[PDB]
Amino acid sequence: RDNKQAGVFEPTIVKVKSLKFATEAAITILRIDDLIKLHPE
């Protein structure tokens, strides 16, 4: 349909900040290539 006519709207900052944070998360996690575990004290 046309959400503009339907009134289905979202605030811009939602999608903007969402995509930005998602990109940062992807950058952080993707750069991983090894975990090293330590059983506790």
Binding site: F21, E24, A25, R31, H39
Partner: protein, 518 residues
């Protein structure tokens, strides 16, 4: 001939070498423009991301002592340079590998150490020869050095904006003339969760993580700042004291009179003309009393509690305001002034203090760090600190080297020809030394996904007349003149790396056996 009776020393040497080499190869991945970071989960339950080697090794709880010496090495390099910690540890690994080769190559370790000393002397001479003197005043070369160090950690994401950040900060904190070793602790780092790393900001001023205590005052203009140490509460002596009540007017005389005392305090404070109050911790005794807060808010004075004693020197350096510890000394002479000071609102409701613009320009400076993940913020601050460190290193020695392993292959070539010239088993030693230096370009090619051996060999062949300007390029995926790709690191970095590694390898060779203790 002479007979070697024992074999325990040789075996323990071998064990140490294998451990060191394994640690080196473990670090080997995280390196260079193509570097890949690691993550360590603490047994406590903490999690960290890191690409810098020193933090990696400090998070390591290494068992075998040799690698603990390696960790210590990395710590020293970081407290000297900031990157190349990866480089210096990888050199250590390669050196010890060639040391193995020389051990089954039957040569006694002491001769190895002496030959290594000759080798490092030749190397330091060559490295000093190859550099390019560079004045501190040229911003763009500084910027190139920055972006060289930066595009190896995660923050290469916003490298383009982070590099001017760091360089401007350092220029504002240095004396551009004395060429001293301007301290990094004069730079304030703020880990503030939320936001975007892009939104990292410089504040030519002062930032306090604490929050306001006045309900009603948020922004103040033309504010005059004053920092006060003596508490604002009922007077409580150093030695034990107590009011005695035995009589009639004692009650109201008390109440009225602590009110009057606090009133005198606040009234003098205003009479100085101040409008923004700073109060340090006084955990030993009473802090700022509530009643005094009431007066101050009534008189419309910006107020802050809980200033850490370690921050006081930084604050007075920055805003240019000597503290006051008694009423009388508090005078309009000492009240500092700043163009603006107020409480910003980020994090939705995570509120922060900024004081921008000061007529008395303190040499110090602060950094605000933004970003989504806590871990990525910590890594970003690590990388920025490394950037400041490398700039300081450049300040220490106004010499510049193109990075990209080209210095190292230069070293390998010159040292190999030097070994060919110099006779004796030390010749074999030095040849091993050059083959050891050969590793860094190999790792660069490997993390670059290029054929390592072919690339290294061709790069040596080029470099036979293709001096240090040429080297391994990431962006083109081949070999070119790196200097024109503007990827340069200060001489001190690799110099310190080589020196530290050489001393540590000599020391390791001195070792023969490990004795368990009580």
């Amino acid at each position: 001939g002479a007979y070697q009776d024992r074999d325990k020393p040789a075996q323990i040497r071998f064990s140490n070498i294998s451990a060191a080499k394994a640690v080196a190869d473990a670090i080997r991945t995280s390196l260079g423009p193509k570097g890949m970071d690691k993550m360590i989960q603490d047994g406590k339950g903490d999690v960290t991301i890191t690409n810098d080697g020193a933090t990696i090794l400090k998070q390591m709880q290494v068992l075998h002592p040799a690698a603990r010496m390696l960790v210590e090495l990395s710590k020293a390099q970081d407290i000297e340079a900031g990157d190349g910690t990866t480089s210096v540890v990888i050199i250590a690994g390669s050196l010890l590998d060639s040391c193995t080769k020389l051990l089954q190559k039957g040569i006694h370790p002491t001769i190895i150490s002496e030959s290594f000393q000759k080798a490092l002397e030749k190397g330091i001479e060559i490295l000093t020869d190859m550099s390019r003197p560079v004045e501190l005043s040229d911003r763009e070369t500084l910027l190139n050095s920055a972006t060289t160090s930066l595009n190896s950690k995660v923050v290469s994401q916003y490298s383009s904006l982070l590099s001017p950040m760091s360089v401007n900060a350092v220029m504002k904190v240095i004396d551009p003339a004395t060429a001293t070793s301007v301290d990094l602790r004069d730079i304030k780092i703020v880990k503030k969760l939320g936001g975007t790393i892009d939104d990292c900001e410089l504040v030519e001023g002062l930032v306090l993580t604490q929050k306001v205590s006045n309900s009603g005052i948020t922004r103040v203009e033309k504010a005059k700042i004053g920092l006060i140490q003596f508490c604002l509460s009922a007077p409580k002596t150093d030695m034990d004291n107590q009011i005695v009540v035995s009589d009639y007017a004692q009650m109201d005389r008390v109440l009225r009179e602590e009110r009057a005392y606090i009133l005198n305090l606040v009234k003098q404070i205003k009479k100085t003309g101040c409008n923004v109050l700073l109060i340090q911790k006084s955990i030993l005794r009473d802090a700022l009393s509530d009643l005094a807060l009431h007066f101050l808010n009534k008189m419309k004075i910006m107020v802050i509690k809980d200033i850490e004693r370690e921050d006081i020197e930084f604050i007075c350096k920055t805003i240019g305001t000597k503290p006051v510890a008694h009423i009388d000394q508090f005078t309009a002479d000492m009240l500092g002034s700043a163009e603006l000071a107020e409480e910003v609102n980020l994090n939705g409701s995570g509120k922060l203090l900024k004081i921008t613009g000061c007529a008395s320009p303190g040499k110090t400076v602060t950094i605000v760090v933004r970003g989504s993940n806590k871990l990525v913020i910590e890594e970003a601050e690590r990388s920025i600190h490394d950037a400041l460190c490398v700039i300081r290193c450049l300040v220490k020695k106004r010499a510049l080297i193109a990075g990209g392993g080209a210095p190292e292959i230069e070293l390998a070539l010159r040292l190999t020809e030097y070994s060919r010239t110099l006779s004796g088993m030390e010749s074999y030693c030095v040849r091993a030394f050059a083959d050891a230096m050969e590793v860094i370009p190999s790792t660069l090619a490997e993390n670059a996904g290029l054929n390592p051996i072919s690339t290294v060999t061709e790069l040596r062949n080029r470099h036979a007349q293709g001096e240090k300007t040429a080297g391994i390029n990431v962006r083109k995926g081949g070999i070119s003149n790196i200097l024109e790709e503007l990827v340069v690191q200060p001489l001190l970095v690799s110099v310190s790396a080589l020196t530290l590694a050489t001393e540590t390898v000599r020391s390791i060779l001195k070792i023969d056996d490990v004795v368990n203790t009580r």
